[PDB]
Coordinates of C-alpha atoms in Angstrom, one line a residue:
Chain A
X1 CA -73.2 126.5 -62.7
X2 CA -75.0 128.2 -59.3
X3 CA -72.4 130.4 -57.8
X4 CA -71.4 129.6 -53.8
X5 CA -71.6 133.1 -52.6
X6 CA -70.9 134.1 -48.5
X7 CA -75.0 134.3 -47.5
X8 CA -76.1 130.5 -49.7
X9 CA -75.1 128.5 -47.3
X10 CA -78.2 127.8 -44.4
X11 CA -77.8 126.5 -41.3
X12 CA -79.1 122.3 -41.2
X13 CA -82.4 121.9 -39.9
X14 CA -82.5 119.5 -36.6
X15 CA -85.2 117.2 -36.3
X16 CA -87.8 117.9 -33.5
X17 CA -89.4 115.7 -31.0
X18 CA -88.6 113.9 -27.8
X19 CA -85.0 114.2 -26.6
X20 CA -82.4 112.1 -26.8
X21 CA -81.7 109.5 -24.0
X22 CA -78.1 107.5 -23.1
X23 CA -77.8 104.3 -25.7
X24 CA -74.3 103.7 -24.7
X25 CA -72.8 100.1 -23.5
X26 CA -72.4 101.2 -19.7
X27 CA -71.7 104.3 -17.7
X28 CA -69.1 107.2 -18.5
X29 CA -69.7 110.0 -17.0
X30 CA -71.1 108.7 -14.3
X31 CA -69.3 105.5 -14.1
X32 CA -67.9 104.8 -9.9
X33 CA -65.0 102.8 -9.0
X34 CA -64.3 100.5 -5.9
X35 CA -60.7 100.5 -6.3
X36 CA -57.9 97.9 -4.5
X37 CA -53.9 98.0 -4.7
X38 CA -53.1 94.7 -6.2
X39 CA -49.6 94.3 -5.4
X40 CA -45.9 92.9 -7.7
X41 CA -47.2 89.1 -7.1
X42 CA -50.4 87.3 -7.6
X43 CA -51.0 88.2 -10.9
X44 CA -54.2 88.7 -12.4
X45 CA -55.9 85.3 -13.0
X46 CA -59.8 85.2 -12.0
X47 CA -61.4 88.6 -11.9
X48 CA -64.2 87.1 -9.7
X49 CA -62.3 87.5 -6.7
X50 CA -61.3 90.3 -7.3
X51 CA -65.2 91.1 -8.0
Chain B
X1 CA -23.9 67.1 60.0
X2 CA -21.3 67.0 57.6
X3 CA -20.0 70.4 57.0
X4 CA -20.3 72.2 53.3
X5 CA -17.0 74.3 52.9
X6 CA -15.7 75.5 49.7
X7 CA -14.3 72.4 48.6
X8 CA -16.4 70.1 49.0
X9 CA -18.4 71.1 45.6
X10 CA -17.8 69.0 43.2
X11 CA -18.4 69.6 39.2
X12 CA -21.1 67.6 37.6
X13 CA -20.3 63.9 36.1
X14 CA -21.8 64.4 32.1
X15 CA -22.3 61.0 30.3
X16 CA -20.4 60.1 27.9
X17 CA -21.3 58.9 24.2
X18 CA -22.3 59.2 20.3
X19 CA -22.8 63.2 20.1
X20 CA -26.5 63.9 21.0
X21 CA -29.1 64.7 17.4
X22 CA -31.6 67.8 16.9
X23 CA -35.0 67.1 18.2
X24 CA -37.1 69.7 18.2
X25 CA -40.1 69.7 15.9
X26 CA -38.7 72.2 13.1
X27 CA -35.7 73.7 12.2
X28 CA -34.8 77.2 14.6
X29 CA -31.7 78.3 13.7
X30 CA -31.0 77.6 10.1
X31 CA -34.8 78.4 9.3
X32 CA -35.4 80.0 5.8
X33 CA -38.1 81.9 5.3
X34 CA -40.0 82.7 1.7
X35 CA -41.5 85.8 2.0
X36 CA -44.9 88.4 0.8
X37 CA -45.6 91.4 1.8
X38 CA -50.2 91.2 2.5
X39 CA -51.7 93.5 1.7
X40 CA -54.2 95.8 4.1
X41 CA -57.2 94.3 2.2
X42 CA -57.6 90.7 1.8
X43 CA -57.3 89.0 5.2
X44 CA -55.4 85.7 6.1
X45 CA -58.5 83.3 5.8
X46 CA -56.7 80.2 3.6
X47 CA -53.3 78.8 4.0
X48 CA -52.6 76.8 0.5
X49 CA -52.5 79.7 -1.6
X50 CA -50.2 82.0 0.8
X51 CA -48.0 79.4 0.6

């Protein structure tokens, strides 16, 4: 039984190499939206015309 | 020259018979409208979809 003192734990060793790149399916922080104001009527039936 | 006094003119004689009926191309006083609020965008291009 090895005692676990306040100095035994050490920080994790992160791997080295080239910096990582974005791999999400779509932009998250830099996304820009073109917005329109849909009224109460004409419910959403087709997305192509909205685009 | 026949003088035209204040009693010479007589009222016009309207024809008699059955009462006249409406003959306009569309209703004028009794017309009823179904109304929608078109926003600034999506300008009027097709009337069938609006109907």
